């Protein structure tokens, strides 16, 4: 009925006037492969040190566990991560490889790594 810049981006905009919801919301050390430790050096628990070690059983209580996490209130949220990085883009879709049809002694290795000259042509 009324046209103008208001009609655009109906779902995308999040703002103050109408979007705001109303009245609603064997071995001494355990196998390296089959073991992973909380602390990763010096405090590693893989190796069964026997004696008066600094390890703590379930009977003792304090300094770790609920006695550390519970102190400070916290909340968590499901925000969306794409992880744009060189590692993440290591499987990015790519166009068909350039093909070399040069017929001269060009040192043209078509079995090695892709060396693209200007325009994306292989060489």
């Amino acid at each position: 009925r009324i046209t103008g810049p208001g009609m655009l981006a109906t779902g995308l905009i999040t703002g103050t006037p109408e979007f705001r919801h109303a009245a609603r919301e064997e071995l001494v050390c355990a196998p390296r492969s089959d073991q992973m430790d909380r602390v990763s050096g010096e405090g590693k628990e893989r190796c069964h040190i026997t004696g008066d070690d600094w390890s703590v059983n379930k009977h003792i209580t304090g300094t770790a566990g609920q006695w550390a996490s519970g102190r400070n209130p916290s909340m968590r949220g499901n925000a969306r991560v794409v992880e744009t990085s060189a590692f993440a883009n290591r499987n990015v879709p790519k166009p068909e490889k350039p093909g070399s049809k040069i017929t001269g002694s060009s040192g043209n290795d078509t079995q090695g790594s892709l060396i693209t000259y200007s325009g994306g042509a292989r060489g």
Partner: protein
């Protein structure tokens, strides 16, 4: 104008198109363009509330299908005085 309208995008090309449509589409001044790191680029404008609503809507619609695309398009009609400390004043 004290209203704030921010549009966030993955990459710069969608942001510059969003800024172009945002400014062409109403009275708004491009106060800042911030690289958030990780790809995210935020372009934010200032103006009167009605103008910012039109500018933000134009930007979100324009840049929705440019490059990686739109992440956020948000409006704050009056940002608290504290928040002004973390907002750019003139474009850079």
């Amino acid at each position: 104008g004290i209203a704030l309208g921010m549009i966030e995008t993955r990459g710069l090309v969608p942001a510059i198109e969003a800024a172009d449509a945002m400014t062409k589409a109403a009275e708004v001044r491009l106060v800042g363009r911030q690289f958030v790191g990780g790809g995210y680029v935020t372009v934010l404008v200032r103006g009167e509330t009605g103008a910012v609503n039109a500018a933000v809507r134009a930007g979100a619609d324009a840049c929705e299908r440019v490059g990686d695309g739109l992440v956020a398009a948000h409006i704050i009609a009056r940002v608290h005085s504290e928040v002004e400390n973390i907002l750019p004043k003139a474009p850079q």
